[PDB]
Design a protein around this motif. Structure first.
Motif, PDB file in Angstrom:
ATOM      1  N   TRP A   1     -44.400  60.128 -28.352  1.00  0.00           N
ATOM      2  CA  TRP A   1     -42.947  60.313 -28.319  1.00  0.00           C
ATOM      3  C   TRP A   1     -42.596  61.616 -27.609  1.00  0.00           C
ATOM      4  N   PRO A   2     -42.324  61.535 -26.300  1.00  0.00           N
ATOM      5  CA  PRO A   2     -41.983  62.706 -25.496  1.00  0.00           C
ATOM      6  C   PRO A   2     -40.738  63.374 -26.033  1.00  0.00           C
ATOM      7  N   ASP A   3     -40.700  64.697 -25.971  1.00  0.00           N
ATOM      8  CA  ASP A   3     -39.524  65.421 -26.423  1.00  0.00           C
ATOM      9  C   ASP A   3     -38.353  64.988 -25.544  1.00  0.00           C
ATOM     10  N   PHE A   4     -37.270  64.588 -26.196  1.00  0.00           N
ATOM     11  CA  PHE A   4     -36.067  64.110 -25.531  1.00  0.00           C
ATOM     12  C   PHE A   4     -36.235  62.719 -24.899  1.00  0.00           C
ATOM     13  N   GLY A   5     -37.384  62.102 -25.145  1.00  0.00           N
ATOM     14  CA  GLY A   5     -37.635  60.766 -24.644  1.00  0.00           C
ATOM     15  C   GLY A   5     -37.457  59.826 -25.823  1.00  0.00           C
ATOM     16  N   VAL A   6     -37.931  58.590 -25.702  1.00  0.00           N
ATOM     17  CA  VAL A   6     -37.828  57.633 -26.805  1.00  0.00           C
ATOM     18  C   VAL A   6     -39.234  57.119 -27.126  1.00  0.00           C
ATOM     19  N   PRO A   7     -39.384  56.377 -28.242  1.00  0.00           N
ATOM     20  CA  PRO A   7     -40.698  55.851 -28.604  1.00  0.00           C
ATOM     21  C   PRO A   7     -41.148  54.807 -27.598  1.00  0.00           C
ATOM     22  N   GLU A   8     -42.463  54.697 -27.467  1.00  0.00           N
ATOM     23  CA  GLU A   8     -43.118  53.756 -26.554  1.00  0.00           C
ATOM     24  C   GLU A   8     -42.428  52.354 -26.527  1.00  0.00           C
ATOM     25  N   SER A   9     -41.853  51.943 -27.656  1.00  0.00           N
ATOM     26  CA  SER A   9     -41.175  50.649 -27.789  1.00  0.00           C
ATOM     27  C   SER A   9     -40.665  50.571 -29.220  1.00  0.00           C
ATOM     28  N   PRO A  10     -39.607  49.780 -29.467  1.00  0.00           N
ATOM     29  CA  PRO A  10     -39.074  49.672 -30.833  1.00  0.00           C
ATOM     30  C   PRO A  10     -40.116  49.138 -31.785  1.00  0.00           C
ATOM     31  N   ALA A  11     -40.886  48.188 -31.278  1.00  0.00           N
ATOM     32  CA  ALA A  11     -41.940  47.546 -32.046  1.00  0.00           C
ATOM     33  C   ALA A  11     -42.981  48.534 -32.561  1.00  0.00           C
ATOM     34  N   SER A  12     -43.432  49.450 -31.705  1.00  0.00           N
ATOM     35  CA  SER A  12     -44.428  50.419 -32.146  1.00  0.00           C
ATOM     36  C   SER A  12     -43.789  51.370 -33.153  1.00  0.00           C
ATOM     37  N   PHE A  13     -42.541  51.737 -32.882  1.00  0.00           N
ATOM     38  CA  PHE A  13     -41.789  52.632 -33.723  1.00  0.00           C
ATOM     39  C   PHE A  13     -41.633  52.037 -35.103  1.00  0.00           C
ATOM     40  N   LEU A  14     -41.075  50.822 -35.157  1.00  0.00           N
ATOM     41  CA  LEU A  14     -40.847  50.130 -36.426  1.00  0.00           C
ATOM     42  C   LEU A  14     -42.133  49.977 -37.195  1.00  0.00           C
ATOM     43  N   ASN A  15     -43.159  49.477 -36.526  1.00  0.00           N
ATOM     44  CA  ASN A  15     -44.447  49.299 -37.177  1.00  0.00           C
ATOM     45  C   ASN A  15     -44.792  50.594 -37.901  1.00  0.00           C
TER      46      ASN A  15
END
Ligand code: BGD
Length: 287
Positions: A183-197
């Motif tokens: 998760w890059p600073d000021f960026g977003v997570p690799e994908s919602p799916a990875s995030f949610l998981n």
């Protein structure tokens, strides 16, 4: 039920008309602004990571010390949803003892890390935990011992098991460390799916359980990525709880949340990705 069709629609209106930046700026201009006197005292000058990132005095977490009780960390208490977090900046080399003292005193069970030690050639966080395996540290200033135990590494995140001991009473506690590593600073997570998981690993561990102290969430400044993480979590709660999940106003909730700590969610796209993750993760949750 049908309700789920109301959110994707609503989300789509915003997407097509790219009204994100507008909404975000609205949320900004509306944000609460309380004083951070304690954060600005000379003695706490080096207990802060950044000059423009401070905890409000009304919600800062106080250390159980007679001399200096300051730590850059706020307590976010969402009443309706009935969940609390402690958002803090990535620890400083001289602030590591404090960090673990807070964990102990607050009775937290889990710690969520959303940033990385190495971010753009710059140090964004100190190494506040054992690396090798079976590695053991000690924090002289706060009398705490920390020991590595487990370490399931993966492609987007890592889960470590740690044993924290109060050297005064010899009392030990198991602390779970969830480290999202992409998760890059000021960026977003690799994908919602990875995030949610990831949020699910965290949720299912019981670390978010109310029978415990609030989970400690942090990144580098503890407002951008952390704000995103908690907003999502809280919103998903509100949906599961209300008869109709749609009635959940993401904007209203974030502004409520920002009453406890400044600048939660730093970009228009973190806000976006936040609607998305809530909407998507909403599928499984609401069934
Ligand atoms: N604005 C900024 O980028 C960051 C904060 C930030 C960082 C990350 C994030 C996030 F979203 F990524 P996160 O996931 O952590 O939530 C959010 C906010 N701020 C900053 O970067 C501010 C910038 C700044 C400099 C001077 C001034 C001033 F001259 F006007 P003055 O009157 O205050 O002296 C004001 C602001 N910098 C800082 O506060 C100190 C330098 C200033 C000083 O202490 O003398 N820098 C660092 O601490 C640093 C640490 C590790 C690696 C590299 C730099």
């Amino acid at each position: 039920k049908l309700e789920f069709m109301e959110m994707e629609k609503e989300f789509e209106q915003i997407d097509k008309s790219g009204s994100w930046a507008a909404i975000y700026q609205d949320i900004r201009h509306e944000a609460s602004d309380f004083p951070c006197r304690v954060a600005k005292l000379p003695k706490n000058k080096n207990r802060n990571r950044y000059r423009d990132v401070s905890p409000f005095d009304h919600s800062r977490i106080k250390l159980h010390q007679e001399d200096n009780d300051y730590i850059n960390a706020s307590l976010i208490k969402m009443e309706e949803a009935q969940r609390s977090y402690i958002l803090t900046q990535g620890p400083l080399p001289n602030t590591c003892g404090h960090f673990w003292e807070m964990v102990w005193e607050q009775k937290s069970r889990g710690v969520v890390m959303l940033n990385r030690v190495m971010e753009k050639g710059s140090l964004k966080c100190a190494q506040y935990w054992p690396q090798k395996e079976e590695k053991e540290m000690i924090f002289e200033d706060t009398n705490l011992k920390l020991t590595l135990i487990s370490e399931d590494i993966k492609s987007y995140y890592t889960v470590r098991q740690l044993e924290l001991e109060n050297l005064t009473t010899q009392e030990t506690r198991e602390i779970l460390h969830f480290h999202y590593t992409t998760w890059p600073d000021f960026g977003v997570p690799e994908s919602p799916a990875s995030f949610l998981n990831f949020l699910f690993k965290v949720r299912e561990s019981g670390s978010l359980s109310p029978e415990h102290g609030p989970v400690v969430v942090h990144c580098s400044a503890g407002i951008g990525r952390s704000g995103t993480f908690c907003l999502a979590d809280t919103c998903l709660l509100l949906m599961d709880k209300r008869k109709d999940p749609s009635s959940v106003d993401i904007k209203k909730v974030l502004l409520e949340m920002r009453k406890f700590r400044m600048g939660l969610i730093q970009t228009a796209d973190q806000l976006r990705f936040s609607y998305l993750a809530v909407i998507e993760g909403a599928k499984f949750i609401m069934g």
